Amino acid sequence: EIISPHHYVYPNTTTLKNKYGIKNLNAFLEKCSHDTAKAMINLREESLPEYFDTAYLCHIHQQLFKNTFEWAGYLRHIPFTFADGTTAAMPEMKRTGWKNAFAIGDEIQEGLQRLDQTLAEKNNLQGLTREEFNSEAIELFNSLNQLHPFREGNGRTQRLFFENLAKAAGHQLNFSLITKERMMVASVAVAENGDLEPMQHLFEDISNPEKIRLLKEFMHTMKNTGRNVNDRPVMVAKEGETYTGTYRGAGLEGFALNVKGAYIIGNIDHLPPEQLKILKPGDKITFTAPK
Ligand SMILES: [Cl-]
Ligand code: NI
Ligand code: NI
């Protein structure tokens, strides 16, 4: 048809039409990644907006991808005509039938106008406790996660939207301290089970100052190591729960385990003083976080 999802990509490829003219997928992805890293640096320095609505969501997307996509500010249900003449739109997404689905067509607008509406009626979640803010914020995050408003680049723009929302609301949400892996698990959990717990967990680690400092310290130890932890899920141990794995060492404020490819961080004071002594890197340890 005249308006098609296939018009987003270069013919006989899967690599999105972009301002660099790069048809090769890996060449494009590197350039997109390099340029959008630069845009983040500047977006973080701009003043927080007076209103948190979809217009602001779009501004973040527009500013991140202004040098990459001609449709930088654009929601995916709106027909977009490129400089090349072809018109693109993707109201479907399409998963396999057995997977959970994203929004289709007019639902995008409905769902986005709904977010706009609740952030207006609740004054950007502004006069709230952490518990209240988080509880309301998770609902909106998940709602926006299933709307999948842009053809691409949802993750970054969504994380910045919510980090800035938190800050304006008198609270914190350091998504910087969350790997691409953890987000995915937490997202998939909501989409399939309706299980909020991994996201509740995620938001808690990222907002509770006592858990921020623990993660901050651990993420520092990854700097200049030559590694990438972004494939690996990192967490602070849930209260009450019991983890068992191999000891990756201690710091001033906290320590780290390895549990089936995942890094669980704990407060150093929650260790029995006497274990802390004779614990060399590699030791198998079981650890139950306290109340
Ligand atoms: Cl993204
Ligand atoms: Ni066509
Ligand atoms: Ni450059």
Side-chain angles (χ1 to χ4, degrees):
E1 307 202 304
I2 283 171
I3 301 172
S4 174
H6 96 80
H7 288 141
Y8 271 112
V9 69
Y10 291 114
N12 308 294
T13 72
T14 55
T15 103
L16 290 161
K17 292 183 186 169
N18 62 74
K19 278 191 172 290
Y20 321 114
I22 296 169
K23 294 165 188 293
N24 172 1
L25 188 59
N26 285 349
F28 157 71
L29 286 186
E30 285 168 9
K31 225 302 167 211
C32 161
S33 179
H34 168 80
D35 277 351
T36 60
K38 271 183 226 166
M40 268 304 318
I41 272 56
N42 300 328
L43 254 185
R44 293 192 185 283
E45 294 304 84
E46 91 174 1
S47 287
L48 302 175
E50 60 191 321
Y51 306 135
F52 284 74
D53 51 10
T54 69
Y56 180 56
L57 198 69
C58 288
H59 173 81
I60 291 179
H61 192 277
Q62 188 273 331
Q63 289 290 294
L64 284 181
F65 297 100
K66 56 188 298 322
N67 299 320
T68 307
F69 305 118
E70 295 179 26
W71 46 268
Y74 286 72
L75 295 170
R76 66 190 244 256
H77 70 286
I78 296 302
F80 175 79
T81 306
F82 290 87
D84 71 9
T86 57
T87 299
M90 184 173 278
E92 193 73 288
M93 292 289 282
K94 196 63 173 175
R95 310 264 292 187
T96 182
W98 51 267
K99 278 174 191 183
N100 187 281
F102 291 125
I104 319 184
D106 290 332
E107 290 171 13
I108 296 169
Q109 189 163 314
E110 273 187 33
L112 283 184
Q113 290 171 168
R114 202 151 86 257
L115 178 99
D116 281 8
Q117 193 68 54
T118 61
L119 285 164
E121 284 162 29
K122 301 191 166 166
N123 306 324
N124 299 326
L125 310 180
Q126 203 145 288
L128 308 176
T129 62
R130 263 209 311 114
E131 298 194 338
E132 286 162 351
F133 171 80
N134 283 343
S135 195
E136 285 282 4
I138 285 179
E139 262 196 65
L140 281 165
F141 185 96
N142 290 335
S143 184
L144 192 56
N145 226 16
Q146 103 88 228
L147 289 177
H148 197 280
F150 305 92
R151 173 57 176 76
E152 184 59 70
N154 295 295
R156 300 148 190 268
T157 91
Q158 199 169 116
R159 288 149 76 117
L160 212 217
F161 181 92
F162 276 94
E163 180 174 324
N164 289 349
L165 191 70
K167 203 198 162 286
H171 303 281
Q172 279 192 249
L173 286 182
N174 281 75
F175 288 99
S176 46
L177 317 175
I178 297 299
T179 60
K180 286 171 190 185
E181 189 60 39
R182 182 170 186 191
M183 252 292 291
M184 193 137 295
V185 185
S187 294
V188 171
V190 183
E192 180 189 342
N193 303 327
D195 184 20
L196 290 180
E197 284 177 4
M199 275 279 288
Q200 287 161 334
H201 190 344
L202 186 159
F203 269 71
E204 164 67 3
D205 285 14
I206 289 318
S207 70
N208 179 3
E210 203 69 10
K211 299 187 176 164
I212 292 184
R213 55 185 263 290
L214 290 177
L215 271 171
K216 275 199 174 87
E217 187 175 77
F218 178 79
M219 297 298 281
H220 157 82
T221 62
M222 304 303 311
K223 226 187 225 71
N224 297 76
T225 60
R227 198 189 225 177
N228 214 336
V229 197
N230 226 240
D231 350 57
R232 271 132 182 68
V234 187
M235 287 128 300
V236 184
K238 255 181 170 154
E239 288 86 32
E241 294 227 283
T242 304
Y243 307 89
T244 192
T246 71
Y247 184 64
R248 269 273 142 61
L252 278 175
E253 297 182 330
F255 65 93
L257 305 183
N258 173 46
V259 190
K260 292 179 182 181
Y263 283 99
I264 310 313
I265 295 169
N267 191 280
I268 202 192
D269 298 323
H270 300 335
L271 286 177
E274 301 181 72
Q275 253 203 327
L276 217 168
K277 297 175 176 179
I278 311 198
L279 246 70
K280 286 135 193 200
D283 283 25
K284 306 143 157 190
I285 62 210
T286 294
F287 172 70
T288 302
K291 62 199 293 181

Coordinates of all heavy atoms in Angstrom, one line a residue, residues 152-190:
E152 N 11.2 3.4 16.9 CA 12.4 3.0 17.6 C 12.8 4.1 18.6 O 12.4 5.2 18.4 CB 13.5 2.6 16.6 CG 14.8 2.1 17.1 CD 14.6 0.8 17.9 OE1 14.3 -0.3 17.3 OE2 14.8 0.8 19.2
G153 N 13.6 3.7 19.5 CA 14.2 4.7 20.5 C 13.3 4.9 21.7 O 13.4 6.0 22.3
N154 N 12.4 4.0 22.0 CA 11.5 4.1 23.1 C 12.2 4.1 24.5 O 12.0 4.9 25.3 CB 10.4 3.1 23.1 CG 9.5 3.2 21.9 OD1 8.8 4.2 21.8 ND2 9.5 2.2 21.0
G155 N 13.1 3.1 24.6 CA 13.9 2.9 25.9 C 14.5 4.1 26.5 O 14.2 4.5 27.6
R156 N 15.4 4.7 25.7 CA 16.1 5.9 26.2 C 15.1 7.0 26.5 O 15.2 7.6 27.6 CB 17.1 6.4 25.2 CG 18.2 5.5 24.7 CD 18.5 5.7 23.2 NE 19.4 4.7 22.7 CZ 20.7 4.7 22.6 NH1 21.4 5.8 23.1 NH2 21.4 3.7 22.1
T157 N 14.3 7.4 25.6 CA 13.4 8.5 25.8 C 12.5 8.3 27.0 O 12.2 9.2 27.7 CB 12.6 8.9 24.5 OG1 11.3 8.3 24.4 CG2 13.4 8.6 23.2
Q158 N 12.1 7.0 27.2 CA 11.2 6.7 28.3 C 11.9 6.8 29.6 O 11.4 7.2 30.6 CB 10.7 5.3 28.1 CG 9.4 4.9 28.8 CD 8.8 3.6 28.3 OE1 8.8 2.6 29.1 NE2 8.4 3.6 27.1
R159 N 13.2 6.3 29.7 CA 14.0 6.3 30.9 C 14.3 7.8 31.3 O 14.2 8.1 32.5 CB 15.3 5.5 30.8 CG 15.0 4.0 30.7 CD 16.0 3.2 29.9 NE 17.3 3.0 30.6 CZ 17.9 1.9 31.0 NH1 17.3 0.7 30.7 NH2 19.0 1.9 31.6
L160 N 14.6 8.7 30.4 CA 14.8 10.1 30.7 C 13.6 10.8 31.1 O 13.6 11.6 32.0 CB 15.4 10.8 29.5 CG 16.4 11.9 29.7 CD1 16.2 13.0 28.7 CD2 16.4 12.5 31.1
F161 N 12.5 10.5 30.5 CA 11.2 11.0 30.8 C 10.9 10.8 32.3 O 10.5 11.7 33.0 CB 10.1 10.4 30.0 CG 8.7 11.0 30.2 CD1 8.2 12.0 29.5 CD2 7.9 10.4 31.2 CE1 6.9 12.5 29.8 CE2 6.6 10.9 31.4 CZ 6.1 11.9 30.7
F162 N 11.1 9.6 32.8 CA 10.8 9.2 34.1 C 11.8 9.6 35.2 O 11.5 9.8 36.3 CB 10.5 7.7 34.2 CG 9.1 7.4 33.9 CD1 8.8 7.0 32.6 CD2 8.1 7.5 34.8 CE1 7.5 6.7 32.2 CE2 6.8 7.2 34.5 CZ 6.5 6.8 33.2
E163 N 13.1 9.6 34.8 CA 14.1 10.2 35.7 C 13.9 11.7 36.0 O 14.1 12.1 37.1 CB 15.5 10.0 35.1 CG 16.6 10.5 35.9 CD 18.0 10.2 35.4 OE1 18.2 9.1 34.8 OE2 19.0 11.0 35.5
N164 N 13.5 12.4 34.9 CA 13.2 13.8 35.1 C 11.9 14.0 35.8 O 11.8 15.0 36.6 CB 13.2 14.5 33.8 CG 14.6 14.7 33.1 OD1 15.6 14.4 33.8 ND2 14.6 15.1 31.9
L165 N 10.9 13.1 35.6 CA 9.6 13.2 36.3 C 9.9 13.0 37.8 O 9.5 13.8 38.7 CB 8.6 12.2 35.9 CG 7.2 12.3 36.4 CD1 6.6 13.5 35.7 CD2 6.4 11.0 36.1
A166 N 10.7 12.0 38.2 CA 11.1 11.8 39.6 C 11.7 13.0 40.2 O 11.2 13.5 41.2 CB 12.0 10.6 39.7
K167 N 12.6 13.6 39.5 CA 13.4 14.8 40.1 C 12.5 16.0 40.3 O 12.6 16.6 41.4 CB 14.6 15.1 39.2 CG 15.7 15.9 39.9 CD 16.6 16.6 38.8 CE 17.5 17.7 39.3 NZ 16.7 18.9 39.7
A168 N 11.6 16.2 39.4 CA 10.6 17.3 39.5 C 9.6 17.0 40.7 O 9.1 18.0 41.3 CB 9.9 17.5 38.2
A169 N 9.4 15.7 40.9 CA 8.4 15.3 41.9 C 9.0 15.2 43.3 O 8.3 14.8 44.3 CB 7.8 14.0 41.5
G170 N 10.3 15.5 43.4 CA 11.0 15.5 44.7 C 11.6 14.2 45.1 O 11.8 13.9 46.3
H171 N 11.8 13.3 44.1 CA 12.2 12.0 44.4 C 13.3 11.6 43.3 O 13.7 12.4 42.5 CB 11.1 11.0 44.3 CG 10.0 11.3 45.2 ND1 10.0 11.0 46.6 CD2 8.8 11.9 45.0 CE1 8.9 11.3 47.2 NE2 8.1 11.9 46.3
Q172 N 13.8 10.4 43.4 CA 14.9 9.9 42.5 C 14.4 8.7 41.7 O 13.7 7.9 42.2 CB 16.1 9.6 43.3 CG 17.0 10.7 43.6 CD 18.4 10.3 44.1 OE1 18.7 10.5 45.3 NE2 19.2 9.8 43.2
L173 N 14.9 8.6 40.5 CA 14.8 7.4 39.7 C 16.1 7.3 38.8 O 16.1 7.7 37.6 CB 13.6 7.3 38.8 CG 12.2 7.0 39.5 CD1 11.1 6.9 38.4 CD2 12.2 5.7 40.2
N174 N 17.2 6.8 39.4 CA 18.5 6.6 38.6 C 18.4 5.4 37.7 O 18.9 4.3 38.1 CB 19.7 6.5 39.5 CG 20.2 7.9 40.0 OD1 19.5 8.5 40.9 ND2 21.3 8.3 39.4
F175 N 17.9 5.5 36.5 CA 17.9 4.4 35.6 C 19.3 4.1 35.0 O 19.5 3.0 34.6 CB 16.9 4.7 34.4 CG 15.5 4.6 34.7 CD1 14.8 5.8 35.0 CD2 14.8 3.4 34.9 CE1 13.4 5.7 35.4 CE2 13.5 3.3 35.2 CZ 12.8 4.5 35.5
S176 N 20.1 5.1 35.1 CA 21.6 4.9 34.8 C 22.1 3.6 35.4 O 22.9 2.9 34.8 CB 22.3 6.1 35.3 OG 22.0 6.4 36.6
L177 N 21.7 3.3 36.6 CA 22.1 2.1 37.4 C 21.3 0.8 37.0 O 21.3 -0.1 37.8 CB 22.0 2.4 38.9 CG 22.5 3.8 39.3 CD1 22.3 3.9 40.8 CD2 24.0 4.0 39.0
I178 N 20.6 0.8 35.9 CA 19.9 -0.4 35.5 C 20.4 -0.8 34.1 O 20.5 0.0 33.2 CB 18.4 -0.2 35.4 CG1 17.8 0.2 36.8 CG2 17.7 -1.4 34.8 CD1 18.0 -0.9 37.8
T179 N 20.8 -2.1 34.0 CA 21.2 -2.7 32.8 C 20.0 -3.0 31.9 O 18.9 -3.1 32.3 CB 21.9 -4.0 33.1 OG1 21.0 -4.9 33.7 CG2 23.1 -3.8 34.0
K180 N 20.3 -3.0 30.6 CA 19.3 -3.4 29.6 C 18.7 -4.8 29.9 O 17.5 -5.0 29.5 CB 20.0 -3.4 28.2 CG 20.2 -2.0 27.6 CD 21.1 -2.2 26.3 CE 21.6 -0.8 25.8 NZ 22.3 -0.9 24.5
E181 N 19.4 -5.7 30.5 CA 18.9 -7.0 30.8 C 17.8 -6.9 31.9 O 16.7 -7.5 31.7 CB 20.1 -7.9 31.3 CG 19.7 -9.4 31.5 CD 19.2 -10.1 30.3 OE1 19.8 -9.8 29.2 OE2 18.3 -10.9 30.4
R182 N 18.1 -6.3 33.0 CA 17.1 -6.2 34.1 C 15.8 -5.6 33.7 O 14.7 -6.1 34.0 CB 17.7 -5.4 35.3 CG 16.8 -5.4 36.5 CD 17.5 -4.8 37.7 NE 16.6 -4.9 38.8 CZ 16.8 -4.3 40.0 NH1 17.9 -3.5 40.2 NH2 16.0 -4.4 41.0
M183 N 15.9 -4.5 33.0 CA 14.7 -3.8 32.4 C 13.8 -4.8 31.6 O 12.6 -4.8 31.8 CB 15.1 -2.6 31.5 CG 14.8 -1.3 32.2 SD 12.9 -0.9 32.3 CE 12.5 -0.7 30.4
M184 N 14.5 -5.5 30.8 CA 13.8 -6.5 29.9 C 13.0 -7.5 30.7 O 11.9 -7.7 30.5 CB 14.8 -7.2 29.0 CG 14.1 -7.9 27.9 SD 15.1 -7.6 26.3 CE 14.8 -5.6 26.1
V185 N 13.7 -8.1 31.7 CA 13.1 -9.1 32.5 C 11.9 -8.5 33.2 O 10.8 -9.1 33.2 CB 14.0 -9.7 33.6 CG1 13.4 -10.8 34.3 CG2 15.3 -10.1 33.0
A186 N 12.0 -7.3 33.8 CA 11.0 -6.6 34.5 C 9.8 -6.3 33.6 O 8.6 -6.3 34.0 CB 11.5 -5.4 35.2
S187 N 10.1 -5.9 32.4 CA 9.1 -5.6 31.4 C 8.4 -6.8 31.0 O 7.1 -6.8 30.9 CB 9.8 -5.0 30.1 OG 10.4 -3.7 30.4
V188 N 9.1 -7.9 30.6 CA 8.5 -9.2 30.2 C 7.6 -9.7 31.3 O 6.5 -10.3 31.0 CB 9.6 -10.2 29.8 CG1 9.0 -11.5 29.6 CG2 10.4 -9.7 28.6
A189 N 8.0 -9.6 32.6 CA 7.3 -10.1 33.7 C 5.9 -9.5 33.7 O 4.9 -10.1 34.0 CB 8.0 -9.8 35.0
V190 N 5.8 -8.1 33.5 CA 4.5 -7.4 33.5 C 3.7 -7.8 32.3 O 2.5 -8.1 32.4 CB 4.8 -5.9 33.4 CG1 3.4 -5.2 33.5 CG2 5.7 -5.4 34.5

